[PDB]
Amino acid sequence: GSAKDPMKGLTELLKGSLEGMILERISRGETYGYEITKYLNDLGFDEIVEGTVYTILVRLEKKGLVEIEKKKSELGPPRKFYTLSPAGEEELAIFWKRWDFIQGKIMQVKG
Amino acid sequence: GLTELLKGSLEGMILERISRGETYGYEITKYLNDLGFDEIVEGTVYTILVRLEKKGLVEIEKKKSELGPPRKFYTLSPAGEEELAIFWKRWDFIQGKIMQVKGGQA
Ligand SMILES: [Cl-]
Ligand SMILES: [Cl-]
């Protein structure tokens, strides 16, 4: 049979989805770049590095979607903790609407 | 405002349309516009198409169309077929995981 694929090479396909995932994770509770990265890796998106997550967090700030608190993490070191602003909450809802639209149309293209 | 989500999905979709029969830029654009993606300009489509050329995923043929006007036609190469199969496998894995996230499960 076919070789068991550990599912790498997802970077390009995750463009557009990545931002939505991060906003979704932030919506659930205050979190930081290292934790967000590990959340995405454990979900199965194994190749996303911390450095990439930082760029997206910067983009989210510029979009006005997140609120930033510097404080000590539970393990010790200071972290930048992100929460959703009301605009972030609304943009997340918009993401799910657009992602649902796109999924349905891709299922038509497959059909 | 679907341009950002379509990035990294549109390549897979265009390869799929090409697999179904020999086609050209204007036709693929119209196919995608009629499907619901009305913000997509032909410039975007041709760029993916040429991106696919430089990756050896498509074979090109300049010839007269059925109606007469000459066009640059696209078919999949052996690499293009394999890439499309990989695309569907990768997309189903990603879709599965995001659906768990949406449902609150992950
Ligand atoms: Cl940090
Ligand atoms: Cl042409």
Residue numbers in the entry:
A (entry chain A): -5 to 105
B (entry chain B): 3 to 108
Extract from the study:
The LftRNtH protein was treated with thrombin protease to remove the N-terminal His6 tag, and the tag-free LftR protein (LftRΔNtH) was used for our molecular studies. As a first step in the understanding of LftR at a molecular level, LftRΔNtH and LftRCtH structures were determined and refined at 2.3 and 2.8 Å resolutions, respectively. Although the LftRΔNtH and the LftRCtH structures belong to different space groups (P3221 and P64, respectively), their overall structures are similar and thus the LftRΔNtH structure will be used to describe the structural features of LftR unless otherwise specified. The asymmetric unit of the LftRΔNtH crystal contains two subunits, namely A (residues from -5 to 105; the six N-terminal residues, from -5 to 0, correspond to additional residues that originate from the cloning vector) and B (residues from 3 to 108), which form a homodimer in an isosceles triangle shape. Each LftR subunit consists of five α-helices (H0-H4) and two β-strands (β1 and β2) with a topology of H0 (residues 4–8)–H1 (residues 11–22)–H2 (residues 27–37)–H3 (residues 44–57)–β1 (residues 60–66)–β2 (residues 70–78)–H4 (residues 80–104). LftR dimerization occurs using 25 residues (buried surface area, ~3380 Å2) from the H0, H1, H2, and H4 helices and the H0-H1 loop through numerous intersubunit interactions. Residues 4–8 form an α-helix (H0 helix) in the LftRΔNtH, whereas the corresponding region of LftRCtH adopts an extended coil structure, indicating the flexible nature of the LftR N-terminal residues. As a result, the inter-wHTH distance of the LftRCtH dimer (~81 Å) is ~11 Å longer than that of the LftRΔNtH dimer (~70 Å). The cavity of the LftRCtH dimer structure (cavity surface, ~277 Å2; internal volume, ~148 Å3) is larger than the cavity of the LftRΔNtH dimer (cavity surface, ~157 Å2; internal volume, ~83 Å3) probably due to conformational changes in the dimerization residues. Upon inclusion, the ethidium bromide molecule makes significant clashes with LftRΔNtH cavity residues (residues 9, 10, 11, 89, 93, 96, 97, 100, 4ʹ, 6ʹ, 7ʹ, 8ʹ, 9ʹ, 11ʹ, 15ʹ, 93ʹ, 97ʹ, and 101ʹ) mainly from the H0, H1, and H4 helices of two subunits.
